[PDB]
Amino acid sequence: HNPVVMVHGMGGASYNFASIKSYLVTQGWDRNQLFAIDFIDKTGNNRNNGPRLSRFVKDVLGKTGAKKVDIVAHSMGGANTLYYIKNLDGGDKIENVVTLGGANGLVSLRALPGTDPNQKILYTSVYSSADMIVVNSLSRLIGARNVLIHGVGHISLLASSQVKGYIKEGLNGGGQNTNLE
Ligand SMILES: O=C([O-])CC(=O)C(=O)O
Structure with a gap:
């Protein structure tokens, strides 16, 4: 497995991922x-969180020696991840992405x-x-592989067993990208 970088959303914190880590x-x-990041800017602005995520991923790669990281992201963390890939230096450092x-x-x-x-x-x-x-x-x-579920609220995405199964599938290479290169 690649190292996993977990990216929280607005008003969030690294402990949001405690149950996903346990799973x-x-x-x-x-x-x-x-590895779960703690952003300083809890409002989620890309100009702050994009660069912070970039440096965090660089640190994870440097301490593990891995070639790429996988990402699990919640709410605004998904936008921050896509900004890192689109505008910054993330385009060659990520393998599997799961957004919640x-x-x-x-x-x-x-x-x-x-x-x-x-x-x-x-x-x-x-x-x-x-x-x-x-x-x-x-x-x-x-x-992408887009997965619609029912009956689970935004915060319960971080606890639900059904959601955890899809995280596992994604981190094991079960996502998709059918766009052109
Ligand atoms: O794009 C690159 O590989 C260079 C890079 O990540 C950095 O400036 O830390």
């Missing part, structure tokens, strides 16, 4: 390869393939018809 450890990920209720369309409505010609970035976008915070048209990405 992944019981499914075979090493606790020492799971992502506010992705504030940056892109396309699953951006990145810049490694040997390997397109693969995406799973999970969103819920019961999400009262992020409308689903912001979460769906053309070219």
Whole structure:
């Protein structure tokens, strides 16, 4: 497995991912390869969070020696991740992306393939018809594996067993990117 970088949303914190971390450890990920960022700007502005994410990923690669990271992102964390890929230095550093209720369309409505010609970035976008915070048209990405679930609220995306199964599938290479390179 690649190291996993977990990216919180507006008003969030690294401890938002505590239950997802516990799940992944019981499914075979090493606790020492799971990394969750804490942004300073809790309002989610890309001009702050994009560069902070860039440096965090650089640090993770430097301390693990991995070639690429995988990303799990919640709400505005999805937009921050896409900004890093689109405008900054993330195009060749990411393999698998999973967004949970992502506010992705504030940056892109396309699953951006990145810049490694040997390997397109693969995406799973999970969103819920019961999400009262992020409308689903912001979460769906053309070219991704888009997964619509029902009955789970925006915060419960971080606890739901059904959501965790899709995270596992995405981190094991089960996302998609059917866009052109
Ligand atoms: O694009 C690159 O590989 C250079 C880079 O990540 C950085 O400036 O830290």
